Amino acid sequence: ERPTFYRQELNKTIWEVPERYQNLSPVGSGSVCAAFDTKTGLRVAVKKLSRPFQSIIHAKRTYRELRLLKHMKHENVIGLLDVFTPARSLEEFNDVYLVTHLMGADLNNIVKSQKLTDDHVQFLIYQILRGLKYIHSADIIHRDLKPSNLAVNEDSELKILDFGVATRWYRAPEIMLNWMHYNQTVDIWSVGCIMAELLTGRTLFPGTDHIDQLKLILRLVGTPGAELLKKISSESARNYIQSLTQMPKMNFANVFIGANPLAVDLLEKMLVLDSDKRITAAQALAHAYFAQYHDPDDEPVADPYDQSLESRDLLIDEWKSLTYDEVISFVPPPLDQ
Numbered sequence: 001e002r003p004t005f006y007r008q009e010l011n012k013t014i015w016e017v018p019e020r021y022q023n024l025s026p027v028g029s030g031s032v033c034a035a036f037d038t039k040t041g042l043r044v045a046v047k048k049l050s051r052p053f054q055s056i057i058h059a060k061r062t063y064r065e066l067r068l069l070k071h072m073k074h075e076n077v078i079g080l081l082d083v084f085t086p087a088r089s090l091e092e093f094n095d096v097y098l099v100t101h102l103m104g105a106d107l108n109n110i111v112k113s114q115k116l117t118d119d120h121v122q123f124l125i126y127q128i129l130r131g132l133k134y135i136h137s138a139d140i141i142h143r144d145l146k147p148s149n150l151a152v153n154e155d156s157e158l159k160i161l162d163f164g165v166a167t168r169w170y171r172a173p174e175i176m177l178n179w180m181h182y183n184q185t186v187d188i189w190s191v192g193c194i195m196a197e198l199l200t201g202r203t204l205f206p207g208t209d210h211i212d213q214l215k216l217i218l219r220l221v222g223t224p225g226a227e228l229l230k231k232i233s234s235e236s237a238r239n240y241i242q243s244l245t246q247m248p249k250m251n252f253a254n255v256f257i258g259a260n261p262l263a264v265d266l267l268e269k270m271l272v273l274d275s276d277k278r279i280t281a282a283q284a285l286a287h288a289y290f291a292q293y294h295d296p297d298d299e300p301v302a303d304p305y306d307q308s309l310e311s312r313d314l315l316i317d318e319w320k321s322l323t324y325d326e327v328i329s330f331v332p333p334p335l336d337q
């Protein structure tokens with residue numbers, strides 16, 4: 001069933017791809033070409049992974065990304081159109097290519113190139129939360145949500161991805177404080193930071209580093225209360241928190257001047273320091289702010305995903321063979337009609 005492959009050098013890089021994919025053109029940097037998919041009609045991104053089996057960290061990362069992308073089947077989350085290698089045997093297996101729908105803009109472009117209406121914010125944050133509900137239901141935490149990880153087309157349809165502007169700006173305070181474990185609601189923190197930026201056109205917490213990032217956060221939300229202090233396991237974190245000059249929680253309505261009050265109320269529900277008290281993605285979808293999009297009959301959950309597999313301690317050649325099996329067992333999506 002093997003397709004016919006053709007070779008081409010593109011910016012001093014070899015590219016060996018099925019005939020299916022035509023008119024490869026580099027779009028930046030592994031490395032990515034825009035292509036025409038003759039099978040489907042669609043414009044695609046073909047990403048040739050960089051040194052996928054260089055080391056155990058690379059091989060594991062390769063395996064994890066392939067497995068995750070094979071699992072994602074939701075309108076607001078990146079999906080896999082195809083995965084291929086030009087190898088006809090495991091023994092000649094060294095290259096992995098991923099194929100996805102080609103993206104135009106990201107949300108860093110739309111924010112930095114527009115003044116967004118409240119109506120448009122409603123729709124974009126809705127879709128982010130709808131993809132997160134799905135991702136979170138598989139017990140997956142994104143951990144890296146920021147505008148550049150959110151693709152948005154000319155129809156304002158949005159997809160969550162991970163390309164793999166500081167990330168720290170959108171990171172929950174518990175990750176700043178190097179918390180041992182963290183909750184799925186770290187991602188809700190990020191959405192709050194993103195939503196804020198879409199409403200104001202400004203980075204909410206542009207910390208120059210991690211201590212500075214905490215400082216800026218605490219300025220808005222206040223220093224921890226005695227309920228929250230009681231939940232700090234770390235002796236060192238606990239001392240440092242108790243060492244702070246107490247700051248009061250700001251009223252977000254006096255900060256987000258001119259914004260829709262329902263949008264402000266939601267921000268108050270997302271940007272809570274205590275993560276146990278943060279609104280969840282599924283709860284967020286039912287907030288009055290999304291009254292005109294929310295459809296509890298069309299906000300699906302994912303099948304369970306076994307994370308134990310990508311976390312084993314295996315040799316390079318074993319991750320390699322496992323990745324090969326995932327490539328071979330790939331079943332393509334159905335075409336539209």
Ligand SMILES: Cc1cccc(-n2nc(C(C)(C)C)cc2NC(=O)Nc2ccc(Nc3ncnc4ccc(N)cc34)cc2)c1
Nearest residue numbers: 027028032045047064065078101102103160161162163164
């Ligand atoms: C590194 C890594 C490791 C493990 C998992 C991931 N994740 N995780 C996810 C979630 C949690 C959201 C399921 C998604 C991914 N991987 C991912 O999104 N991969 C991806 C992202 C962007 C592209 N690239 C382009 N695509 C579409 N148009 C373009 C147009 C231009 C351009 N330069 C690039 C592109 C290809 C693959 C990522």
Ligand SMILES: CCCCCCCCO[C@@H]1O[C@H](CO)[C@@H](O)[C@H](O)[C@H]1O
Nearest residue numbers: 173174181182183231273274275276
């Ligand atoms: C000084 C700023 C540090 C405040 C960090 C507290 C915010 C995190 O909140 C904490 O998240 C944990 C991780 O999932 C949970 O186990 C705790 O119950 C929760 O209170």
